[PDB]
Amino acid sequence: MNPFASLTLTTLIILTIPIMMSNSNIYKTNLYPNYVKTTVSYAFTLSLVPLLMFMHTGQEMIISNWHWMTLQTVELSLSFKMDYFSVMFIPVALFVTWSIMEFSMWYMHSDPFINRFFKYLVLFLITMMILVTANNLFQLFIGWEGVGIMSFLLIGWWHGRTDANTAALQAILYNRIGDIGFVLSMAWFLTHSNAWDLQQIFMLNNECPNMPLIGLLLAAAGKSAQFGLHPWLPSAMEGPTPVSALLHSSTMVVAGVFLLIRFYPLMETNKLVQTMTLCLGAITTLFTALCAITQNDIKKIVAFSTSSQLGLMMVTIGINQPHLAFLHICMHAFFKAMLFMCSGSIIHSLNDEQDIRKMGGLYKAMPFTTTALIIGSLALTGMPYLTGFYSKDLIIEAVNMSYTNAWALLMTLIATSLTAAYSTRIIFFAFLGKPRFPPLVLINENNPLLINSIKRLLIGSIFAGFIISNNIPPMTVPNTTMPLYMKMTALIVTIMGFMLALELNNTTYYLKFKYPSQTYKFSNMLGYYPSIMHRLPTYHNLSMSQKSASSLLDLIWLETILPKTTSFIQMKMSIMVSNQKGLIKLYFLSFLITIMISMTLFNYHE
Amino acid sequence: HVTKDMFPGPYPKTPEERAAAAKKYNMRVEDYEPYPDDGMGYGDYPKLPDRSQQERDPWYDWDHPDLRLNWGEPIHWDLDMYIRNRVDTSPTPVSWNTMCKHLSGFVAFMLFMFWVGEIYPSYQPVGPKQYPYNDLYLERGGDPTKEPEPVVHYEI
Amino acid sequence: SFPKYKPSRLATLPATLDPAEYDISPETRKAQAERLAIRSRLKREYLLQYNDPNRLGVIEDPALIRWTYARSANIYPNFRPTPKTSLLGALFGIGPLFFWYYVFKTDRDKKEKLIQEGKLDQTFNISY
Amino acid sequence: MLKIIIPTTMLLPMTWMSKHNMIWINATVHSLLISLISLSLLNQLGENSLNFSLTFFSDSLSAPLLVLTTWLLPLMLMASQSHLSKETTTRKKLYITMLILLQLFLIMTFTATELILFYILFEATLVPTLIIITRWGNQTERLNAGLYFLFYTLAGSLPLLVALVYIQNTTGSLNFLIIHYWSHPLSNSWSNIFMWLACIMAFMVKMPLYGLHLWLPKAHVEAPIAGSMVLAAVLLKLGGYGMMRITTILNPLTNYMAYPFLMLSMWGMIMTSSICLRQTDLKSLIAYSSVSHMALVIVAIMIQTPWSFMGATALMIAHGLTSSMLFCLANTNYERVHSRTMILARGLQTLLPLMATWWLMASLTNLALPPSINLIGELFIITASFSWSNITIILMGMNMMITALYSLYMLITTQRGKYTHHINNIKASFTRENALMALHILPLLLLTLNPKMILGPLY
Amino acid sequence: SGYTPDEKLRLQQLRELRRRWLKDQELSPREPVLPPRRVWPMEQFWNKFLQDGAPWKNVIYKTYRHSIFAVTHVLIPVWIIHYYLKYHVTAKPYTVVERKPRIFPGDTILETGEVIPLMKEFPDQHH
């Protein structure tokens, strides 16, 4: 019927074709990575038509094509929600992964299993599309968990490395803590609303109580690496740089805040849960931005930046601005993925060196990487009329103007200063100054794949905010009247962060040396959260799991109580009964006792 | 190959079977020390320093380089918990108690200030936002038969 | 000096901070030499089998077998019922069971009391 | 049921009359043919059961179990013929005879219309199982394992026999249909409390309930591979199936009699999942994971909801397939390095790539990754438990977290890292082993397309 | 203080052996030897046409590749999906339900033909 449905579906189906072909003949040749990148580009081009139809008239639909099973009164079907969020996020994600695959064709060129790497990228993309388009909670869970396992397999891509496997299992662990809340919300919605599809859930929950929303918040805090379940995202940098850029910076890690956006009608009607997510986002953004300003690994700095941006998304959700959060997801994807590709360009040019202390002088040696990184950091810091200005600046405006927790407002403003600070750190150490890398200069960014993918996301990072802001309908009411000092708040704080970081960075040129303060130690060692929480709870869990769970109970007391004591009693009785003198005399004396007892107290003869 | 005499036994009571236990586990007698005999079933298994495998020398040529283990040498009772995929006991720049104090103080201070900002919220100097038709009584799902109590806004 | 580093169970004392590394007696030297000799004997024994062209399979490791036997089959032959083991067994085996029974029983009695007076709303609970 | 039972019986004369070198070929071919025939039992009715004769009937609960048994027999045969290659012709025929006898007993157990006939057939499964474990197991520990398994089961089962004959004397029938249609409420008295305990404890020890489970690590570890396959896949399910059948005469006594068992299983799933995190024996870790899934099945049966029963049925099917797959995967490494120690052979993905893929699939199914039927069963049970009491979500979420941790830990330690330097006998995976894993994994995933086939009669 | 004579000698001997081993890892020009294979007629037209690889031939090779990819990965799947939705999925109620279009004052309804009335006169706020 209406081409919208067929095109929205076909965009998803084409993704799976290179997976079915991953055993035919092309998967054995060197044409497979280009093949899958080409189908991703074609899927992006196809997905624009649903986007254009929505842009014109707001075409939205839900499609329930295949009935899977009915559970008495609960019908579970393959249902796709082709709404604004789906038809806007699909083209953005497809564009970003198109750039990432073209980048990987250069960055992972020497990987002996590059075909399997590209296949894993397509599998993750397919699972994320399932996550995003899912119209019921079971299908959403399928996308959620497939995304999680794809992240596990891509973080531990180099599986001979202990730290990579540890990081992959750590991601699984934190996301399972979040999955507890996800399954809690599924159980609650089944029990109370008799549905996992979004339509009836929104229908029967005009006043949604705390428990399902707290479960959804737990799942979101797990997936988006909020404070408490945050450490796995920076450790996910163990994956290859394309894995970081695709999954853990731009597309996959926004699944949690996207989960919260998908249930915004429910979150709208619960002030307590709104305050909880607002405060969690505030602490996440502040703490993660604090960690980044002292990190020396470029990928670690960008990962902490991604965590800070996810915290900001949580903040704007917590002030009842879900569409602002979605806009920020779409805007952030462009320049965050592009920033990670710039970092990967530097790393590849510097022979897998990732320390900014060994970087320097790359402003001129890598002119295009420099231009791209500078534009991306300007977009990140909310420079006016770039891509980040059309979401982040409005977010700061809304948080300043709302009835909010005062501490959360202060923390998000301070984190807005700190993002400029860590962008300054990246630029100052990687590009400015003098070369600090080994003398054998291998700097070479002249590759069409690298240049072209970074270029596409560069044009996105410049113009995407203006194009998307003016083409979506107004899904909110604007803040037209605020004080001038409040209108320029974001610019003023980011300028303050820029200037203070520049002052501090320039001091490192002075011929003075002082041992670090305790605040530096708190920031650089990440608040000691991994040092404490990866050693104490795991040690106690594993120590108990041996000492009390296995030895004490199973091997000792569960043995002692039923089988061992019973066997001992039987053996003792056997010894008492069996060991006899073999004397006629004793046997017949016992016979006299038995005969007398039968004719006496044992009332038989009477 | 591995006879009955090569297996772990009960806790050594006298110093000659303690030396025999040290010999069985390929240790010096002065280095061998069993777990205390408290009824927990440790037997004569040596109680080695509770040091993670991450604390072993990475530049040495181990027979098992990943586990940082040498063939025939006594395995710690807690090897599968102290592998490098797991609990790390490595010395830190800042001491453990100081890290605990700083992390806990940070978290407690943040929680307290969040509560304070809840009881001292930030807002703008505006009256409530006004909606027509009795604050959208019908649009919000009000019963279309029962008449709402009029909510009237005024040109100030 | 400088602020002291305090070792812990999970953040131990580094070797360079250990006073014993700086007061070394001749008997400590002899102990180190004997440790090196034991380690060299084990290393030589392993490398002889390892580099053998006519060995196929796994070099059986007595330390590994001792470790796996101590953790499984040697525990009950050497367990004794003492006040520590009995207190710990009662606390960890029976304690959580009655704790969870109390929690769940209290919750379900509250639920049933709500149901009896109809104070629990189940407007759309038709799946159980 | 005779069109299923008689072909299975005909496996014995065919096995004993075939050539010495056609034993495995003939048994595999005709057991697969019997499994094809058993699929027609999945054509079930919405309301009634398939009541063939006075002595055998089939419904949506027992049909997937029958299919699982008939499918397990050929996979058993493929798993066994490697380690039994050096055995004599007569002894191979005796092993095949034991497997056929076990399958025949299981087939009649799941279709017996009468409770006492079910009891005899479910007790008969002990004999070939015990013979397999104690005669063809590898270690000296197989004897003690056999004694534990035998006497745990019998101490459970004999009071059930007494209770069944008492019920027949007081009610007049042990017929399942009559028992359902003439159901009397069970009053609150010591007599009825002990009747409940007698009716329940045999199935409790069979599943096994946490605290009554110490036979299972011994038996599933010491047994030969086919024995472990059946013990994990079909023999544990006898307790769940019997509990589902017999709980129709235990109401409303089950409302409060289940509290100790609900507590035991809800905490013991945590306890045994934690034990898996520290198991140094691969086969023992796989054996210990069965206790947690069966604890979930115990909770589901004890709370007595349609969703709980659906989840328990699906979980039993999925666990059978997955646990047998995991045992086979461990056995393939055992047959190479002749040891069950898990950290002996590390970094196996760079030596056996497709076997590493099979390992990843098995771990993912043990993870209960959606939309697998493992996840369907677990999620249905979790939702029913949440309705039963919201606080159950803490323990079940903890359990799924720990399950993820130990499953992926086993995967990482066996498949990932650096290969062991001195192990130079990891030969390439045989076609037989790869086919074994494929025949484990393919029907598991196909069931996701038609999940109602394993959702039981309450679907 | 440096290598002992024994250490130096053993290191140089192991060095010679290792260098001989590493030189021996090099492939010969014949290596690897490939087994025979068959060429399909679709690709048989390309070793006779694209054997030159001219710029005008590169454009047509990319055109053939892109047209085949477009039909086999876009046109056939969209055909199957459109058929599925148009004749099976939408043959059941409420399967594809579309949010109705917003309707504004002035609007003419296609189906009935009615004209939506224009809003009342604005109170005329002037900027």
TrEMBL record, chain B:
Keyword Membrane: yes
The keyword Disulfide bond is assigned to this record: no
Keywords annotated in UniProt: Electron transport, Membrane, Mitochondrion, Mitochondrion inner membrane, Respiratory chain, Transit peptide, Transmembrane, Transmembrane helix, Transport, Ubiquinone
Any one GO biological process: mitochondrial electron transport, NADH to ubiquinone
Record's bilayer topology term: Single-pass membrane protein
Compartmental location: Mitochondrion inner membrane
GO cellular component: mitochondrial inner membrane; respiratory chain complex I
Similarity field: Belongs to the complex I NDUFB8 subunit family.
Subunit structure: Complex I is composed of 45 different subunits.
Described function: Accessory subunit of the mitochondrial membrane respiratory chain NADH dehydrogenase (Complex I), that is believed not to be involved in catalysis. Complex I functions in the transfer of electrons from NADH to the respiratory chain. The immediate electron acceptor for the enzyme is believed to be ubiquinone.
Name the record gives this protein: NADH dehydrogenase [ubiquinone] 1 beta subcomplex subunit 8, mitochondrial
Gene, per the UniProt record: NDUFB8
Automatic annotation (TrEMBL), chain C:
Assigned keywords, A-Z: Electron transport, Membrane, Mitochondrion, Mitochondrion inner membrane, Respiratory chain, Transmembrane, Transmembrane helix, Transport
Main location: mitochondrion
GO cellular component: mitochondrial inner membrane; nucleoplasm; respiratory chain complex I
Localization (cell): Mitochondrion inner membrane
InterPro entries: NADH_UbQ_OxRdtase_NDUFB4_su (IPR009866)
Topology class, membrane: Single-pass membrane protein
A Pfam family recorded for this sequence: NDUF_B4
Quaternary structure and partners: Complex I is composed of 45 different subunits.
Family label: Belongs to the complex I NDUFB4 subunit family.
Function summary: Accessory subunit of the mitochondrial membrane respiratory chain NADH dehydrogenase (Complex I), that is believed not to be involved in catalysis. Complex I functions in the transfer of electrons from NADH to the respiratory chain. The immediate electron acceptor for the enzyme is believed to be ubiquinone.
Protein's name in the database: NADH dehydrogenase [ubiquinone] 1 beta subcomplex subunit 4
From TrEMBL, chain E:
InterPro entries for the chain: NADH_DH_b-subcmplx_su6
Stated role: Accessory subunit of the mitochondrial membrane respiratory chain NADH dehydrogenase (Complex I), that is believed not to be involved in catalysis. Complex I functions in the transfer of electrons from NADH to the respiratory chain. The immediate electron acceptor for the enzyme is believed to be ubiquinone.
Protein's cellular compartments: Mitochondrion inner membrane
Family the UniProt entry places it in: Belongs to the complex I NDUFB6 subunit family.
UniProt keyword annotations, A-Z: Acetylation, Electron transport, Membrane, Mitochondrion, Mitochondrion inner membrane, Respiratory chain, Transmembrane, Transmembrane helix, Transport
Keyword Membrane in record: yes
Amino-acid positions noted as binding cholate in the UniProt annotation, renumbered to this chain: R65
Transmembrane segments: 67-85
GO BP of this protein: mitochondrial electron transport, NADH to ubiquinone
Electron transport in keyword set: yes
Gene that this sequence comes from: NDUFB6
GO CC annotations, alphabetized: mitochondrial inner membrane
Top-level division of the source organism's lineage: Eukaryota
Membrane topology field: Single-pass membrane protein
Main localization (coarse): mitochondrion
Subunit structure: Complex I is composed of 45 different subunits.
Name listed for the protein in its UniProt record: NADH dehydrogenase [ubiquinone] 1 beta subcomplex subunit 6
